Each structure stands twice: as C-alpha cells, then as structure tokens.
Amino acid sequence: EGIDVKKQENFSEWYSQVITKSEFLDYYDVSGCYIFRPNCWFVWESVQKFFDAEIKKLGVQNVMFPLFVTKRALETEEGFSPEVAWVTKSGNSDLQEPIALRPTSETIMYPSYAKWIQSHRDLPLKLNQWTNVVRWEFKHAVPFIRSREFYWQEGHSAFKSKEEADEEVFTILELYKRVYEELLAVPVIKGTKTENEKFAGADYTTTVETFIATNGRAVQGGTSHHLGQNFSKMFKIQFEAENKETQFAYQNSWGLSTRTLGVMIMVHGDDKGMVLPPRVAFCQVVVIPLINATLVEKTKEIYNELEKAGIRVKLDDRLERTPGWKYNYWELRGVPLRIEVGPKDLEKQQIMLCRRDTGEKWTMPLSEFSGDSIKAVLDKIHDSMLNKARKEMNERIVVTRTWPEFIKALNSGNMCLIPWHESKAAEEYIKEKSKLESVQSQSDANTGLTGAAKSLCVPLDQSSFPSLEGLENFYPEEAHKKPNCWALFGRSY
C-alpha cells in the first residue's frame, strides 16, 4: 500500500519496504538469496539486451561453461577459499570427489582457452556468458548489492598483443558507464583500483564507481581487468606468432552483476517507492481514465498509438478503484509517466501528464500528442534523473589535502580526493585510522557496514584536480614517498 519509513529516517528499512512493496523482490529461506519478480527481472533482461548488442559489435560471442569446478582446477590459481561453496553429497551418500560451485570462471574456462588457441589466427578469442555465481560472502548480505547467489555477465578475452588487450579494457569500461548512465540514469566515475583493491590475478583493474547519497557510500559498479600474461602462463595459453616464435596470450576479464539494480534503486527511489528510469521500466506509461462512452474510446486510442510506437504502455480501467488509489499503485511500482484522461480535459482537447521523478503535472494538447512526443517526455525524465544524481554526486566529492579535512568530510558523508602515492601499507593505515575516528548510523551498523574509508579508485581523468605541490603523504611512515596523483577514498558497501 505505502512506504511507511522515510529514506532519510532508516535507509535499510526504507530499502526493504521499497523493493518488496514495489513487487521487485522477495526474501527467501536461504540466507543471502533473493527472489527476482517480473518487474525486477525485466530490468536485468534490459541490461542483457543492450550489453549483448554492444559486445556483438566487438566480435564477442556468448557461451555457457559449467556451474561446477574441480578442486584441482580451482587451486590452479587461500584468500578466497572460505567463500567457496562445496557439493559433497548426492542423496544420502558422500561423493568420493567434492566439487565446487562457480565463484567466477577463470579456472573453468582457461584450460579450454589453452586448447583452442594454437596460432595467432585463433586470436582474438572473445567469449561472454550470462550466468549465476555463488560466493559464501562473510559480509552481511544486501539485496542486489551483495547476495550469496547473484547474476552477472563475465567476459574473457585473449589477444596476441598488449595494445589490443589494453584497448578492450577501456572499451568495456565505457560500455559499463553507458549501462549505468544511459539505461539506469546513474552517474559513474572511471578509475583504476589501487594495488590492495585490484584483482590479485590482474596487472591492473579498472572500475566504474557509483555513489549512494543517502548514507554517503560508494558502490563498486562493475570491473574490467587487464590480466596481462598472468593467467596465460598459469594455464599455458600459448600461440605461434606470425614471427614463428611461441608467445603467451594477453588476456582480459570483465564483469557486471545484478548489483546494478540495487544501485539504481538506492540512487533513484523516494518516499513514494520505486522510480524507474524509462529505458528499463517494465511499464513506461500508464493511462488512467477518470470515471464517458467517448472518453473510453479516446483512452483506447491513446493506448493504441503508444503501443504501436513501441512504448510499454498499460491501460488501467479497473472499475472498483479510485483514481488516487491507482495513482499510488503505479507510483509505488515506479512507472515513470502517467496519463490522466478526464472529461474536463477532453473538452479542451488535451490530456494531463504526471512525471514520477519530480511529481510535476502538466497538460499536453492532443494536437501535440504522439509516440515521438511521449518518447521525448521519457527522455526528458531520463536526463533529469541522471543530471540530478550527478549534481548530488559531484557536490559530495571533496578535495581533502590534510587528515583533519579528510575525516571531517568522511563523517559528513562525502567522498574524498586525497594526495596519493601507491602503497598497500598507506591504504591499510588510512583504513584503520579513519575507522577509529569514524561514526556511522545505526542502520548502517545493522547492515554490517563500517565507517572506515577505503580506496575507491584512482580517477582516470585527473585534469580538473588541483596541484599536488607541497602536499604530504597521509601515511607518516611513508612521508618519503611523494604524492604523485589523486585518489578517491570513501565509505563503501
């Protein structure tokens, strides 16, 4: 019926109410696993359709490798071993050989890559799969953001040269930016991860960072690695080059998950419920006749013209429901645009429009109604949602040249740009010190989160940042390691 807790009052309770009452998600009796209902799964299918079409242009092909992986394969690569789920029984009998569930597919796929790649004519090899993933997360589960079963695509490419591989890393990273910005209306920051946060198997890791303004937390939104020759040496992925010598392939891997849906909801949801970006909305426009014979047919005509134009449109002519009840029903579920067709408005040859993101109501003359004009309204809603979130995000990025500035901005829910010289020890120092001086909400503490700051990324584009002249390393033991770039640090999920 309604959200009874405000987003600003208790973020975790608000989130639970919005994802369930919108019919997006239900809870389940295996901890950390969730049910994706139709309006929710539609968003992920929309991401799939867009991403598939974009990677097809790059020559990537979809495959399906198995869910199961042997201990022998997995151990070809300690740190992650507590998160692996093990199948050990069939029926009532122990298996002679326990097997694990897919936590990622490097060790499942790369023995095949070593078989399939024999010469440079076999390269590039670029494969993708849309799969479920299992990780027995130690951290508290969070619907969409951190689930023990989640859904993703993982792409794995092999190249004859580093230049080709480098180019794909940033091409895929741009596609992840386009998913967030063009489909989900969520702004991103591109950067590289620090040595402590990057994939241990990667030469370097790139990320799109996203930001949750309500509790001032970043979310790692998607990942694109250059693996160098680290895995090709591990798995003997070699080829005869055109120069007749044998070389190790250069590889990348990259993944994007249903975490996207959680970011979308946390960024755009409000105290009336879901707010769906038009390009992933299960229903983009709901038409509601206010209740007469002629009004019904014009309402049917409005429905049919939008449907013919490819707009996902619904006609809510339910009899036993008041107009206001219908308004709440579809606002709760996130429909971006409502058309109200009333008798008074029909007399003036017009209709009433209400946009979900701002609540604004305005009239449109029927002479200006069309599939194109309604699509233009939907694009305006998309642009406003993205622009509002980007303005909020940018206002919450603070340049913090010194520790007192850093901890102050962190405690007020900002992301911080700090002078940086790469060092695992410096990053650990910052994490421990900020954690000791941090404060966080009871809701965040209940969600298993910490007030500690961690590295989010080193932004790719440093051109707008101020001078590093005279700035000191945040880690006093490494004052002799002069800062030479800016890093983004903040609280995180």
Ligand X SMILES: O=C(C[C@H]1NCCC[C@@H]1O)Cn1cnc2cc(Br)c(Cl)cc2c1=O
Residues at the contact surface with ligand X, assessed by CB under 6 A: 74, 80, 83-84, 103-104, 106, 135, 154, 199, 223, 253-255
The least CB distance from residue 257 to ligand X, in Å, is: 9
- HSE of 254 in the Cβ direction (CA atoms, 13 Å)? 30
Is 146 a binder of ligand ANP (CB under 6 A)? Answer: yes
* Residue 224 near ligand ANP by CB under 6 A: no
Among a copy of itself, ligand ANP, ligand X, none, residue 222 binds (CB under 5-8 Å by kind):
ligand ANP
Among the listed ranges 7-15, 39-47, 362-370, 387-395, the one in contact with a copy of itself (CB under 8 A) is 39-47
> Cβ–Cβ contacts within 10 Å for residue 490, how many?
24
| One character per residue 112-141, x = contact with a copy of itself (rule: CB under 8 A) | x--x-----------x----x-x-x-----
| 36 lines the binding site for a copy of itself (CB under 8 A) | yes
Q: Residue 197 forms beta bridges with which residues?
A: none
Indicate whether 221 belongs to the interface with ligand ANP (CB under 6 A). yes
Nearest to a copy of itself of 38, 310 (CB atom): 38
Nearer to a copy of itself among residue 99 and residue 290 (C-beta) = 99
Distances from the Cα of 31 to the Cα of 85, 108, 143, angstroms: 14, 26, 11
**The two structure tokens encoding residue 310:** 């490819």
Q: Which two tokens stand for residue 51?
A: 């991403």
Closer to a copy of itself at the Cβ: 283 or 409?
A: 283
Q: How many residues bind a copy of itself (CB under 8 A)?
A: 51
| Non-local CB neighbours of 228 within 8 Å, separated by 6+ positions | 162, 165, 202, 203, 250, 251
Greatest CA separation for the chain: 82
243 binds a copy of itself (CB under 8 A): no
Q: Binding partner of residue 34 among ligand ANP, ligand X, a copy of itself, none, CB under 5 to 8 Å per kind?
A: a copy of itself
- Segment 298 to 357, residues that bind ligand ANP, using CB under 6 A: none
Distance CA 184, CA 268 (A): 9
Dist CA 293 CA 50 (whole Å) = 42
- Closest-CA residue to 291 (of 366, 248, 342): 342
Q: Pick the closer one to a copy of itself by CB: 83 or 477.
A: 83
Task: Report the alpha-carbon angle 171-486-263, nearest 5.
Answer: 55
State the Cα–Cα distance between residues 334 and 267, nearest whole angstrom: 13
Say whether 325 sits in a helix, a strand or coil. helix
Minimum distance, C-beta of residue 31 to ligand ANP, in the bound complex (Å): 13
Minimum Å gap between C-beta 217 and ligand X is 20
Backbone torsions φ then ψ of 283, nearest 5 degrees: -130, 125
What is the C-alpha separation between 453 and 406, in angstroms, rounded? 10
8 Å CB contact between 87 and 70: no
The stretch among 21-29, 169-177, 259-267, 483-491 that binds a copy of itself (CB under 8 A) is 21-29
Nearest to 474 by CA among 409, 413, 427: 427
Give me the residue label for tokens 């911080």. Answer: 416
Of the candidates 319, 311, 312, the one whose C-alpha atom is nearest the C-alpha of residue 288 is: 319
Among 62, 161, 370, 438, contact with a copy of itself (rule: CB under 8 A): 62
The yes or no reply on residue 273 touching ligand ANP (CB under 6 A) is no
Q: Kindly state whether residue 473 participates in binding ligand ANP, applying the rule CB under 6 A.
A: no
User: For ligand ANP, which stretch binds (CB under 6 A), given 10-18, 216-224, 311-319, 430-438?
Assistant: 216-224
Is 263 or 302 the residue whose CB approaches ligand ANP more closely? 263
User: Is-contact 227 157, C-beta < 8 A?
Assistant: no
Residue 253, binding choice from ligand X, ligand ANP, a copy of itself, none, Cβ under 5 to 8 Å by partner class:
ligand X
From 333, 46, 343, 26, select the one nearest 185 (Cα to Cα): 46
Among 99, 141, 241, 290, which residue interacts with a copy of itself (rule: CB under 8 A)?
Answer: 99
In the list 39, 220, 230, 447, the residue contacting ligand ANP (rule: CB under 6 A) is 220
- The alpha carbon dihedral of 97, 98, 102, 103 has a sign of negative
Q: How far is the CB of 157 from a copy of itself (least distance, A)?
A: 13
The neighbour count for residue 168, using CB atoms within 10 Å, is 22
Of 1, 53, 57, 88, the residue at the interface with a copy of itself (CB under 8 A) is: 88
**150-169 footprint of ligand ANP as x/- string (CB under 6 A):** x-x-----------------
Nearest of 84, 89, 221 to residue 148 by alpha carbon? 84
Chain residues in the site for ligand ANP (CB under 6 A): 104, 135, 137, 146-147, 150, 152, 220-223, 255, 257, 259
Chain residues in the site for a copy of itself (CB under 8 A): 26, 28-30, 33-38, 41-42, 44-45, 61-70, 72-73, 81-93, 98-99, 101, 111-112, 115, 127, 132, 134, 136, 149, 151
